[PDB]
Point group: D2
Chain length 115, copies 4
Amino acid sequence: PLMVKVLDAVRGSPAINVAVHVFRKAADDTWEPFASGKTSESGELHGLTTEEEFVEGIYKVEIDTKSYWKALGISPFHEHAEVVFTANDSGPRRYTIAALLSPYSYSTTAVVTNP
Amino acid sequence: PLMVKVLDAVRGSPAINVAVHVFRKAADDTWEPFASGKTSESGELHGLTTEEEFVEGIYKVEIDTKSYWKALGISPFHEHAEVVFTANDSGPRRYTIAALLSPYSYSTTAVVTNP
Amino acid sequence: PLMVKVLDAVRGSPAINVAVHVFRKAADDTWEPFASGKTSESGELHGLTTEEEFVEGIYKVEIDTKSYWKALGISPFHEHAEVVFTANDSGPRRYTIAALLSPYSYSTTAVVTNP
Amino acid sequence: PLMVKVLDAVRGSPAINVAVHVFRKAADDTWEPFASGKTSESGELHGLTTEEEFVEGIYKVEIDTKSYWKALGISPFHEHAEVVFTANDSGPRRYTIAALLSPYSYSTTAVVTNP
Ligand SMILES: CN1C(N)=NC(=O)/C1=C/c1cc(Br)c(O)c(Br)c1
Ligand SMILES: CN1C(N)=NC(=O)/C1=C/c1cc(Br)c(O)c(Br)c1
Ligand SMILES: CN1C(N)=NC(=O)/C1=C/c1cc(Br)c(O)c(Br)c1
Ligand SMILES: CN1C(N)=NC(=O)/C1=C/c1cc(Br)c(O)c(Br)c1
Ligand SMILES: CN1C(N)=NC(=O)/C1=C/c1cc(Br)c(O)c(Br)c1
Ligand SMILES: CN1C(N)=NC(=O)/C1=C/c1cc(Br)c(O)c(Br)c1
């Protein structure tokens, strides 16, 4: 139900080995750890959560962009990219959180499907 | 070797049934028809060409965005989105041409892989 | 030295009356309030800080995109757009933080100039 | 009434000295030259046309992105960025055509205002 995809707009490629941390806003309004991983050779991170565990709520996806650009010898602007959204608030959905990265810019979109 | 993917940034979904026409710049410098199709339920168009036929050159991918937005009752700015690029000019590659659409904006990127 | 500009990709217009909150990372590694305001009729927010006060550090620009869309007869995907970056690490610069908004996507860029 | 602005997502700067060519679709359905220029140090191109001359029609803005990148020690993906749109179909408007450039991606938006 939750997948993250990261692309590199400088090289025209998947962004490989990018670290991702996912949080859920708790009953008390603080950010509780939820899931993490690194992108694959296809720039994708699967297997973050299960349908059962991915209940309605506010989630934060942090994508560690800065370390990615440094490893490539390219000077970056942002510390990371943070995507904060409400999930499943009309019922269970499958989410792809995509990020397209440049050193001084990024784009993020959600593709939300109903099985 | 050539795939086109189209996303809708208003609805957060694949852009389905979007018409695509692909041209190749000919020896004479004019735009010759090459391939066409419509996006699927996943917003993807596969099977445009074969490795054999997809030789080096300048290609144009025209995505008929205007008809897409009209069918949805949303007022659009652009007539279409046109992506013009040189392909295979360091050797054969697999290309994904992605377009993320809004009524008054679009983003396009290429994901270029080497099998 | 710090300006925020916000555009609406649905309407093709400035995003007016968008609330913005700016934080700076403190010596103790928490987010200290730094500046705030709302975008004007041109989608711009000037007058956030002064050259003297805008020293080197990690800054967070929170753009309250959800309320913008909730006001217009949308229900968007994101809670807000956050832009986190290190400022003035090579000396004083002027920063424009731009954001282009759609209901299920946004893009953000920085324009960094040396006066 | 018509302005073009071009930004560089790699450097976080205006894209300076970018060539732009503007065409209008003629009664006979071919592309007639209309206006041209190069972006300034602010990445902007003003003075393309006048209110009197900029009547309703289909316009094409060609932004010569390849030469921009070829000058800088890149070899980009796209030959150019083309933006094709109907102007003034509900009456006279002022248009800013913005483009944010990366080597393998670009985004383009319109800001359309009613003076
Ligand atoms: C379905 N639904 C409606 N109509 N309004 C909601 O807030 C809602 C939430 C929801 C329901 C289930 Br069952 C589920 O597994 C997940 Br996750 C979310
Ligand atoms: C995500 N994205 C953004 N933010 N700008 C884009 O052009 C874009 C494209 C995209 C490309 C592929 Br390929 C893909 O599988 C998915 Br999902 C999205
Ligand atoms: C490989 N190569 C190099 N080094 N410079 C080129 O222009 C080039 C082009 C090319 C070669 C093959 Br065989 C092919 O199937 C495709 Br289509 C493109
Ligand atoms: C100039 N400089 C260099 N070379 N490395 C730095 O970290 C740095 C920081 C800086 C200096 C001044 Br004076 C200033 O007003 C601001 Br604001 C930032
Ligand atoms: C105003 N108007 C309406 N209502 N429908 C149109 O097609 C239209 C076009 C138009 C009118 C003027 Br007078 C003008 O200077 C420019 Br230029 C465009
Ligand atoms: C144009 N644009 C795109 N396509 N993606 C962006 O983030 C973006 C930002 C933009 C930034 C400034 Br500064 C500006 O004056 C204008 Br007019 C637009």
